[PDB]
Symmetry: C4
Subunit: 548 residues, 4 copies
């Protein structure tokens, strides 16, 4: 842009210089020496002089003609010999060298820039959220106050990088935060607080803050943030659920008090190896298989679907419906004891989780946690010798390996699995490049940080048409009224009446479900509906069915 | 400088021109018997050196060949090598050489007078500069830190010099004698060194910002014309804002300021609690409640409930904000006074819930600024 | 690459030449009725583009003027801009661009086979390289450390790649499948990661240098074809050299080696004293006498007098030298075995008084080297 | 050198190309078209073609002539249009940019380099030894293994800088250590040991090692070093001598057992304010004023010389002669108590000194000395408040301020002198740029590290014709034999007879001395000689006087 324009702007000047001279010449030849020259001769002459070719076939004779020739000559040397080779070189050669040779840190965004997604605080999660959602070519812009880090992210991108204080309002003004589509506040909690209060001072643009300590959750909504994600606590959960010898029930959401969305690791459970229709999970409980999570993907349930031990079943149903699956697994193993190696915010979160549903564990680390005063820790280097065995890794029913270094995690998983082939080992993979290797070391399940993080933010980013809608709302299930047996969702006109929206229609006699049905969907008899609206829209719903 | 070297070389070139154009007209006459008009001589000489080469005006004698060969090369050496080099070197070097690698300015020009020497850059001084360059005073900051001279050179509005502020030779190059005023905002021992050294070269007025108020008379002693105990003052402004029985003021942060503020609330007896993480390396006369205020029930275990005032005094604004935000959530009616190092965060401490905010940079600049034009 | 782009552009230029020289001869004939020999066409075309401009062969019709104007510019664009650029860009860029700022090599060519991947550079491997490039094997070292890739790139004899040795995509670019052998000389957890990852891409032989000998079977388990417990071995070589009653051997230095050596002198019961400064982060089974050996009567308070042998095992050669020098001064007849990390200091440990010197780099290279060509 | 040669080598080729072409042309014109051209025409043509001037007055006509013209044309564009502008630019423009833009670290010395002085371990002392002895333009070469430090020393020099391991023998080989004049080993003691053992492996070049811990002195001579300087211990001495309220006697050398070279701070002594002849120091004791040290300079004593309080008197005489000056000062003040603020190697050395001649002191510091277990230290920050007064700085007779930071030293000296105007304050100046300011703060005397260091090394460097001669020798004084009353030193021919050398001849009845007398010096009656030879040369001396 700014360099190419300067180029052919200067070419327009040169062509003007040409056409001018070629005519001044034809004038002089006529008015000085009495020679009528064709126009092309004027061009041909002028070119020949400036370019310093100088054929000498067309020359002047009067001193006056000498002067104008001398002039045109120099004008060739100044503008075709100096500037034009300079400009061709300066606009082409400078970018390759000046910008690799020394950083020219981008400090501001263009005036017109809109629709971008501001990333504040780069790390494995966000870096993975970027590589994943640039598959829709969103304009991802990351920001850093760290000069040497802006260097790295500028040479390898994918995403434009800005260098500056994320709290300085003037900086945020140059980032056109008002015209932004969404802002990801992935800094420290006090910086996240500063960040939000500052953005709320310039605009109202949606801010998804990733909070470290879950207690600071309400404090960041308070700082302005539209949605808060306690990632460290969540990953701890996913670890504690994966470690419980027999796959246990995990509660995801309490939609008012009507419906519970939950999940279940199929491992060590009578549904493992068995299929969906074979297990007949919906039939015996009345539950709703809203989706199955196997190989890092969200898929719709099928009857012919075999549940691997590695699988995770999402659920939806009443409190007495979930209860029916805590008995269809369904007995706890005697002498449970889970080693949690690593007392980060995650290992601590996981230990807080295994506390919530009482399973005794041992927290092993090297130094004491700067954050936690409520967890007793066994102190000692796990890498060095008999440390795990002195704690008694022998009577353990599960090892959760939670170091912030993947290479170490691998080496423990490798060390444990060698030492005990049959025990449940759950590891944690910061960088998702090491996921495959924790499995290959012997991990029964691997929780990739980057992957789980990106998936949450990603979903919260493209659901951001109704994510703050979904926030502060209740989701419910309604047995489809027989009056609408055979009628379209569109023909029924449910949303203009009630305000609720259909997200899923399952079969009357099947574990199969149709999720996010199109407006042209013809309803069926007995088909069980599951919708999302306000608490009060679930309410006025029952009329607009009775009304019409 | 670089421009002078350019058109000095253009004067030489025009001399070369007028000379050659006349040597030519001489030769044509004295070698081959051709009288050429002066303009023809210029026109020829230009045509040769510029290597255009029309060939309408040529010599014939071997002698004429020689002078033509000479004028030809002189064109290639001075219009083909130097003049494109010089146009490129004076224009292209500054954009690249100076962004690409630092050429640290080590000295001030001979004639430089009326400048205001800044020694020890920080939020205060940086704010004193943006504020008093609205009268376009020549602000010159100095640092012994190479990597810091880099930052301040690319972003300016003030020229930056790299060198030891205590080395007398350095101060001599800074023309301290002809200076209008000197701001000594370093450590107390450095400030002392700085003054004793300037008093050795001149008598130029020196406004020293003293950290520990006891060292105040020691710096006037080092030469300083006026001494400003900024940390003590900001503590005062905090203690005054927090009172305005069962009075009880939490002071979160035991810096020199929170300690100054606690020393202030002592002077007019109001009971307070000093909360911090580590013990103050400077104070042995204030009892401190030790514990991280960010982590959980720390403030409540001290009893933030029967408190009539919280003074939030961390040296990090983002943390101050997050406390003010945390306190005001926890207690809507109590007087919360916060402190804003960088004045970019002032608005946000208010927005968090601060009943009053004391901006360091702002209060500092205002004092120095006033002391500078009242000088 | 860069050379190809050059004479590819020369082929285009010669095409431009032969084309123009014929278009010209055509025009002269079809425009003005002048038959020109082919060489005249070349000679003209050269003369125009090169901007020489003799003016002996010129057109007269406006049409001829146009084609001449065209050929003229085509000379200025392709002989005046690109050809001097390209000669400069392919020649001048490598000397400057690559010394001036690093362009870190991130990947290996498609066809690269028969190479020996080095993972984890240090005195041993660096010595294994200088020794086995006497058969001109393609040694490629890898590092995730940017500033270390710089050093190893300017001083080589081995190509350097910058990247995570555990990232599978990185290993894919290194053509690990077509590799001849891989040397895993990282930490034990990294070595484990490294192997499990290579075993995921290929089955290429991996010689892992294991630090703690207990992790030996764990690395064969990670895939490694052969495991070398170098630290344990060097300890052995030290313990053997120090015996060869009242036998009593001082082992100065409680590294993995001095600890290995002490474990060795345990296996065939000879009483010793382990002297160090801090406690070993790895060993809880060796009692150590704590105290700085450099500072005064430390060795004599332990009783270096009734000792039958000193094993000097510091990870600094200059210190080892200074101890060996200090001991041999203090006791001429006692058996002193020292350890030489860098083999540049071997001669000096002898010269200080070492009865035998165990060079780390040398013993390491010899083992790996043998394991590499016996492979 | 290497770049200029490549330039005019290429100019020789160009002129060859010229003279060749100009003759090929004249040949062709004759053998192709039948035109005899003068030689100058050939040059003139050839120039005109290659330079792309192209007058077109002299052209060919045959196709053959076209070819050779086309050839000469291109040869102009390749060698006058590409290389010659490149080479003019590359040899001129590269040094200014390539070398400022990125370091090209000098890794080796030229083959022929001899007579240089290798500096190993740059610091205030050596940097001052360099600025001082480049006033004789010696080739000072400093060496460092620190890349970022080689950068600094290369841009500011004065002295060429080499980058490499000073212990690596190959490195030392490139430094041509064999052809070296002298080597200064100013590294750590183990590095100094390594350095010497390595140099002794390549050559025998003289090595002056600056030893930190004085106990390691004999260990470095053992490593090869020809002379060892325990600088830290010496500076401690100079501090302890300066602090003793009344100027005390300090013993410099025990030449066998015959003669003692000593010194005396004149401060607080009855010679202060008084002159040399007025005090009549030589007269009452028999001592020899070998030189006076006032303002950082070594000067010959004069009778009309006033001894300031700041002065230091060097001495030479027997054990009973020095004794006579420990009573002419001469009484110790009651209640002596010296604060030594700073427990470095120097403050510790100074405290070890004030121990040797029992004066009670207080060692104050912040942390405990990693090196000393024999000095009890009062721990506490001296900058912070009542720390000095709680130790009782009130009953102190002297403060020695010995921090490794000058700005702090200044601030203490400034703080003490404020607190106590009359007490003896001795400070220490690392960098000699701060010396003036310690005085201006109130220091009664300032010991500049850099200055005292350079002066020792400097002297040891230019005395290196007889420094190792002076080492292991004894210096003596002899009452000039009356037989040589009126005879020259040269006429006497003392050195070929005895082997001793005259360094000083003083007057029979004067405190004045003539030092390093020229060979043409006519002796006098009673004039007292002081010479330097071997222990055994002082012996055989008494014959060669009795012989003739
Ligand atoms: Ca991996
Ligand atoms: Ca802000
Ligand atoms: Ca060596
Ligand atoms: Ca100074
Ligand atoms: K012509
Ligand atoms: K003609
Ligand atoms: K021409
Ligand atoms: K021409
Ligand atoms: K030309
Ligand atoms: K040109
Ligand atoms: Zn915890
Ligand atoms: Zn305090
Ligand atoms: Zn051990
Ligand atoms: Zn001591």
């Amino acid at each position: 842009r700014q360099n190419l324009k300067v180029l052919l702007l200067y070419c327009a000047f040169l062509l003007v210089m040409l056409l001018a001279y070629a005519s001044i010449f034809r004038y002089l030849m006529w008015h000085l020496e009495g020679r009528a020259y064709s126009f092309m001769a004027g061009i041909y002459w002028t070119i020949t002089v400036m370019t310093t070719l100088g054929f000498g076939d067309i020359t002047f004779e009067s001193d006056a003609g000498y002067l104008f020739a001398s002039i045109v000559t120099v004008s060739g040397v100044i503008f075709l010999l100096i500037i034009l080779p300079f400009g061709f070189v300066s606009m082409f050669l400078a970018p390759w060298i000046e910008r690799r040779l020394r950083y020219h840190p981008t400090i501001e965004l263009p005036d017109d820039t809109r629709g971008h997604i501001l990333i504040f605080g780069i790390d494995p999660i966000t870096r993975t959220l970027i590589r994943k959602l640039e598959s829709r070519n969103h304009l991802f812009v990351v920001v850093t106050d760290n000069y040497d880090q802006a260097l790295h992210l500028e040479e390898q991108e994918g995403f434009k990088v800005v260098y500056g204080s994320p709290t300085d309002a003037h900086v945020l003004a140059g980032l056109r935060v008002a015209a932004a589509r969404s802002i990801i506040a992935n800094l420290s909690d006090p910086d996240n607080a500063n960040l939000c209060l500052t953005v709320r001072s310039l605009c109202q643009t949606p801010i998804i803050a990733v909070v470290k300590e879950p207690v600071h959750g309400e404090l960041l909504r308070l700082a302005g943030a539209n949605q808060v994600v306690p990632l460290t606590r969540i990953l701890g959960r996913y670890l504690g659920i994966r470690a419980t010898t027999c796959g246990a029930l995990a509660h995801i959401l309490d939609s008012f008090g009507n419906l519970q969305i939950a999940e279940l690791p199929v491992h060590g459970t009578p549904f493992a190896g068995k299929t969906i229709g074979e297990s007949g999970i919906r039939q015996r409980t009345g539950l709703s298989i809203i989706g199955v999570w196997e190989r890092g993907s969200l898929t719709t349930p099928q009857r012919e679907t075999v549940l691997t031990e590695q699988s995770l079943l999402v659920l939806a149903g009443t409190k007495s419906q979930l209860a029916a699956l805590e008995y269809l697994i369904g007995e706890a193993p005697e002498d449970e004891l889970i080693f949690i190696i690593g007392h980060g915010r995650i290992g601590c979160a996981a230990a807080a989780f295994l506390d919530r549903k009482p399973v005794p564990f041992i927290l092993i680390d090297r130094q004491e946690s700067p954050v936690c005063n409520d967890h007793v820790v066994v102190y000692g280097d796990a890498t060095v010798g008999q440390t795990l065995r002195q704690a008694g890794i022998d009577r353990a029913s599960g090892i959760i390996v939670t170091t912030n270094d993947d290479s170490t995690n691998i080496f423990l998983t490798l060390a444990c699995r060698h030492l005990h082939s049959h025990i449940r080992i759950v590891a944690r993979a910061n960088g998702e490049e090491n996921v495959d290797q924790l499995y290959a070391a012997g991990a029964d399940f691997v929780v990739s940080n980057a992957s789980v993080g990106a998936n949450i933010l990603g979903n919260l980013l493209e659901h951001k048409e109704s994510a703050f809608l979904s926030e502060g709302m209740a989701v419910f299930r309604r047995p489809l009224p027989p009056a609408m047996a055979g009628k379209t969702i569109a023909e029924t006109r449910l949303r203009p009446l009630t305000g609720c929206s259909i997200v899923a229609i399952e079969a009357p006699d099947r574990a199969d479900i149709l999720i996010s049905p199109p407006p042209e969907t013809i309803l069926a008899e007995g088909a069980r509906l599951i919708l999302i609206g306000t608490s009060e829209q679930e309410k006025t719903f029952d009329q607009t069915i009775a009304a019409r």
